[PDB]
Amino acid sequence: ATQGVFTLPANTRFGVTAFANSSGTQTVNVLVNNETAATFSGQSTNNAVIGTQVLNSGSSGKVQVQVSVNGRPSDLVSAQVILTNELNFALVGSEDGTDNDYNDAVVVINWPLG
Ligand SMILES: *C(=O)C[C@@H]1O[C@@H](C)[C@@H](O)[C@@H](O)[C@@H]1O
Ligand SMILES: [Ca+2]
Ligand SMILES: [Ca+2]
């Protein structure tokens, strides 16, 4: 199944934040309505924040997260969780190698803001 794709309510601000846990340099792209809206790159084996950004979900609300390492697309896992019928997390893990810890780049999307 498709992973890393989330339908947010339209014209809603959301945060996106990436963490790195790999020897490979992680590149994270965030697409709103299939248009690159933010990109983060960095390397860490200690969960360093490699980027954080506030975005608007636009007319569509379609947000997609992509992860690659030196150009090679990582395998993604994702899900959305809603707490007390209000607070939204869209979560992404990624695997760039063979050990399958799926933390090589970790991306957290959250809304509402403000
Ligand atoms: C490359 O060595 C693989 C890679 O980096 C490791 C340090 C570890 O984070 C592993 O999960 C990652 O796939
Ligand atoms: Ca890994
Ligand atoms: Ca890792």
PDB file of C-alpha atoms and ligand atoms in Angstrom:
ATOM      1  CA  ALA A   1       0.000   0.000   0.000  1.00  0.00           C
ATOM      2  CA  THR A   2       0.900   3.650  -0.449  1.00  0.00           C
ATOM      3  CA  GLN A   3       2.777   5.178   2.492  1.00  0.00           C
ATOM      4  CA  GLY A   4       3.739   8.722   3.411  1.00  0.00           C
ATOM      5  CA  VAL A   5       0.608  10.298   1.893  1.00  0.00           C
ATOM      6  CA  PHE A   6      -1.885  12.118   4.106  1.00  0.00           C
ATOM      7  CA  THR A   7      -5.112  14.032   3.444  1.00  0.00           C
ATOM      8  CA  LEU A   8      -5.242  17.026   5.767  1.00  0.00           C
ATOM      9  CA  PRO A   9      -8.156  19.460   6.029  1.00  0.00           C
ATOM     10  CA  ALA A  10      -7.784  22.091   3.338  1.00  0.00           C
ATOM     11  CA  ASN A  11      -5.968  25.389   3.946  1.00  0.00           C
ATOM     12  CA  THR A  12      -4.682  24.241   7.343  1.00  0.00           C
ATOM     13  CA  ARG A  13      -1.263  25.042   8.764  1.00  0.00           C
ATOM     14  CA  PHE A  14       0.789  22.062   9.888  1.00  0.00           C
ATOM     15  CA  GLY A  15       4.273  21.363  11.170  1.00  0.00           C
ATOM     16  CA  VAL A  16       6.743  18.955   9.621  1.00  0.00           C
ATOM     17  CA  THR A  17       9.924  17.833  11.371  1.00  0.00           C
ATOM     18  CA  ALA A  18      12.596  15.314  10.367  1.00  0.00           C
ATOM     19  CA  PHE A  19      15.047  13.317  12.486  1.00  0.00           C
ATOM     20  CA  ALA A  20      17.994  11.263  11.227  1.00  0.00           C
ATOM     21  CA  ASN A  21      19.364   7.928  12.515  1.00  0.00           C
ATOM     22  CA  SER A  22      21.694   6.508   9.871  1.00  0.00           C
ATOM     23  CA  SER A  23      25.218   6.544   8.516  1.00  0.00           C
ATOM     24  CA  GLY A  24      23.663   7.681   5.243  1.00  0.00           C
ATOM     25  CA  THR A  25      22.845  11.323   4.587  1.00  0.00           C
ATOM     26  CA  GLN A  26      19.038  11.636   4.592  1.00  0.00           C
ATOM     27  CA  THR A  27      17.074  13.849   2.202  1.00  0.00           C
ATOM     28  CA  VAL A  28      13.416  14.485   3.116  1.00  0.00           C
ATOM     29  CA  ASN A  29      11.019  16.176   0.677  1.00  0.00           C
ATOM     30  CA  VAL A  30       7.548  17.395   1.685  1.00  0.00           C
ATOM     31  CA  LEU A  31       5.049  17.790  -1.161  1.00  0.00           C
ATOM     32  CA  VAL A  32       1.825  19.786  -0.858  1.00  0.00           C
ATOM     33  CA  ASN A  33      -0.505  19.237  -3.816  1.00  0.00           C
ATOM     34  CA  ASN A  34       2.349  17.372  -5.559  1.00  0.00           C
ATOM     35  CA  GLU A  35       4.683  20.393  -5.397  1.00  0.00           C
ATOM     36  CA  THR A  36       7.878  20.452  -3.344  1.00  0.00           C
ATOM     37  CA  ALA A  37       7.126  22.691  -0.356  1.00  0.00           C
ATOM     38  CA  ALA A  38      10.090  21.842   1.903  1.00  0.00           C
ATOM     39  CA  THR A  39      13.303  19.822   1.781  1.00  0.00           C
ATOM     40  CA  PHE A  40      15.598  18.789   4.633  1.00  0.00           C
ATOM     41  CA  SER A  41      19.008  17.155   4.356  1.00  0.00           C
ATOM     42  CA  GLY A  42      21.356  16.032   7.090  1.00  0.00           C
ATOM     43  CA  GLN A  43      23.131  13.155   8.764  1.00  0.00           C
ATOM     44  CA  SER A  44      22.937  11.863  12.321  1.00  0.00           C
ATOM     45  CA  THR A  45      23.019   8.580  14.201  1.00  0.00           C
ATOM     46  CA  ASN A  46      21.725  10.445  17.275  1.00  0.00           C
ATOM     47  CA  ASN A  47      18.221  11.568  16.211  1.00  0.00           C
ATOM     48  CA  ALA A  48      19.342  15.096  15.287  1.00  0.00           C
ATOM     49  CA  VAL A  49      16.619  17.350  13.905  1.00  0.00           C
ATOM     50  CA  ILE A  50      17.638  17.813  10.260  1.00  0.00           C
ATOM     51  CA  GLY A  51      14.757  20.176   9.500  1.00  0.00           C
ATOM     52  CA  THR A  52      11.479  21.674  10.708  1.00  0.00           C
ATOM     53  CA  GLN A  53       8.965  23.824   8.882  1.00  0.00           C
ATOM     54  CA  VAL A  54       5.419  25.189   9.045  1.00  0.00           C
ATOM     55  CA  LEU A  55       3.401  24.620   5.872  1.00  0.00           C
ATOM     56  CA  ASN A  56      -0.138  25.123   4.596  1.00  0.00           C
ATOM     57  CA  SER A  57      -2.070  22.096   3.306  1.00  0.00           C
ATOM     58  CA  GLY A  58      -3.400  24.170   0.382  1.00  0.00           C
ATOM     59  CA  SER A  59      -6.606  23.712  -1.585  1.00  0.00           C
ATOM     60  CA  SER A  60      -6.077  19.946  -1.820  1.00  0.00           C
ATOM     61  CA  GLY A  61      -4.822  19.003   1.631  1.00  0.00           C
ATOM     62  CA  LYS A  62      -2.660  16.337  -0.054  1.00  0.00           C
ATOM     63  CA  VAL A  63       0.685  16.130   1.763  1.00  0.00           C
ATOM     64  CA  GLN A  64       3.312  13.572   0.747  1.00  0.00           C
ATOM     65  CA  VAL A  65       6.649  12.782   2.416  1.00  0.00           C
ATOM     66  CA  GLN A  66       9.548  11.284   0.474  1.00  0.00           C
ATOM     67  CA  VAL A  67      12.903  10.063   1.820  1.00  0.00           C
ATOM     68  CA  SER A  68      16.052   9.195  -0.117  1.00  0.00           C
ATOM     69  CA  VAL A  69      19.714   8.551   0.732  1.00  0.00           C
ATOM     70  CA  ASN A  70      22.265   9.630  -1.892  1.00  0.00           C
ATOM     71  CA  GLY A  71      19.377   9.391  -4.378  1.00  0.00           C
ATOM     72  CA  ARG A  72      18.124   5.923  -3.411  1.00  0.00           C
ATOM     73  CA  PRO A  73      14.458   6.019  -2.284  1.00  0.00           C
ATOM     74  CA  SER A  74      13.936   4.618   1.200  1.00  0.00           C
ATOM     75  CA  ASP A  75      11.115   2.220   2.014  1.00  0.00           C
ATOM     76  CA  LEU A  76       8.448   4.110   3.971  1.00  0.00           C
ATOM     77  CA  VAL A  77       6.023   3.170   6.743  1.00  0.00           C
ATOM     78  CA  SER A  78       3.363   5.589   7.941  1.00  0.00           C
ATOM     79  CA  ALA A  79       0.118   6.118   9.866  1.00  0.00           C
ATOM     80  CA  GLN A  80      -2.074   8.896  11.233  1.00  0.00           C
ATOM     81  CA  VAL A  81      -3.222   9.083  14.867  1.00  0.00           C
ATOM     82  CA  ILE A  82      -5.853  11.408  16.357  1.00  0.00           C
ATOM     83  CA  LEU A  83      -5.953  12.121  20.094  1.00  0.00           C
ATOM     84  CA  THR A  84      -9.109  13.322  21.889  1.00  0.00           C
ATOM     85  CA  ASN A  85     -10.744  13.757  18.458  1.00  0.00           C
ATOM     86  CA  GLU A  86      -8.674  16.870  17.821  1.00  0.00           C
ATOM     87  CA  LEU A  87      -4.872  16.535  17.822  1.00  0.00           C
ATOM     88  CA  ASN A  88      -3.413  14.991  14.660  1.00  0.00           C
ATOM     89  CA  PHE A  89      -0.085  13.234  14.052  1.00  0.00           C
ATOM     90  CA  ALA A  90       1.009  11.931  10.653  1.00  0.00           C
ATOM     91  CA  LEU A  91       4.046   9.711  11.214  1.00  0.00           C
ATOM     92  CA  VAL A  92       6.631   8.373   8.748  1.00  0.00           C
ATOM     93  CA  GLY A  93       9.506   5.953   9.186  1.00  0.00           C
ATOM     94  CA  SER A  94      12.051   4.987   6.545  1.00  0.00           C
ATOM     95  CA  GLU A  95      14.618   2.259   5.898  1.00  0.00           C
ATOM     96  CA  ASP A  96      17.684   2.961   3.756  1.00  0.00           C
ATOM     97  CA  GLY A  97      19.478  -0.364   4.261  1.00  0.00           C
ATOM     98  CA  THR A  98      18.982  -3.939   5.478  1.00  0.00           C
ATOM     99  CA  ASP A  99      18.667  -3.812   9.284  1.00  0.00           C
ATOM    100  CA  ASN A 100      15.010  -2.671   9.079  1.00  0.00           C
ATOM    101  CA  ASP A 101      15.004  -0.368  12.076  1.00  0.00           C
ATOM    102  CA  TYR A 102      12.937   2.069   9.938  1.00  0.00           C
ATOM    103  CA  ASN A 103      14.332   5.106  11.796  1.00  0.00           C
ATOM    104  CA  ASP A 104      16.885   6.253   9.195  1.00  0.00           C
ATOM    105  CA  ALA A 105      14.756   9.329   8.583  1.00  0.00           C
ATOM    106  CA  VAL A 106      11.781   9.858  10.916  1.00  0.00           C
ATOM    107  CA  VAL A 107       9.221  12.504   9.900  1.00  0.00           C
ATOM    108  CA  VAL A 108       6.478  13.887  12.173  1.00  0.00           C
ATOM    109  CA  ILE A 109       3.598  16.000  10.861  1.00  0.00           C
ATOM    110  CA  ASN A 110       1.271  17.626  13.382  1.00  0.00           C
ATOM    111  CA  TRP A 111      -1.806  19.856  13.283  1.00  0.00           C
ATOM    112  CA  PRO A 112      -3.654  22.054  14.188  1.00  0.00           C
ATOM    113  CA  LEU A 113      -1.100  24.722  15.031  1.00  0.00           C
ATOM    114  CA  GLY A 114      -1.534  27.982  16.903  1.00  0.00           C
TER     115      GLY A 114
HETATM  116  C1  LIG B   1      24.545   1.960   6.727  1.00  0.00           C
HETATM  117  O1  LIG B   1      25.513   1.654   7.382  1.00  0.00           O
HETATM  118  C2  LIG B   1      23.140   1.561   7.206  1.00  0.00           C
HETATM  119  C3  LIG B   1      22.526   2.531   8.156  1.00  0.00           C
HETATM  120  O2  LIG B   1      23.326   3.294   9.077  1.00  0.00           O
HETATM  121  C4  LIG B   1      23.502   2.601  10.352  1.00  0.00           C
HETATM  122  C5  LIG B   1      24.430   3.415  11.264  1.00  0.00           C
HETATM  123  C6  LIG B   1      22.137   2.271  11.035  1.00  0.00           C
HETATM  124  O3  LIG B   1      21.467   3.494  11.390  1.00  0.00           O
HETATM  125  C7  LIG B   1      21.257   1.587  10.002  1.00  0.00           C
HETATM  126  O4  LIG B   1      19.924   1.378  10.563  1.00  0.00           O
HETATM  127  C8  LIG B   1      21.116   2.382   8.726  1.00  0.00           C
HETATM  128  O5  LIG B   1      20.245   1.637   7.822  1.00  0.00           O
HETATM  129 CA    CA B   2      18.015   1.243   8.778  1.00  0.00          CA
HETATM  130 CA    CA B   3      19.033   3.517  11.536  1.00  0.00          CA
END
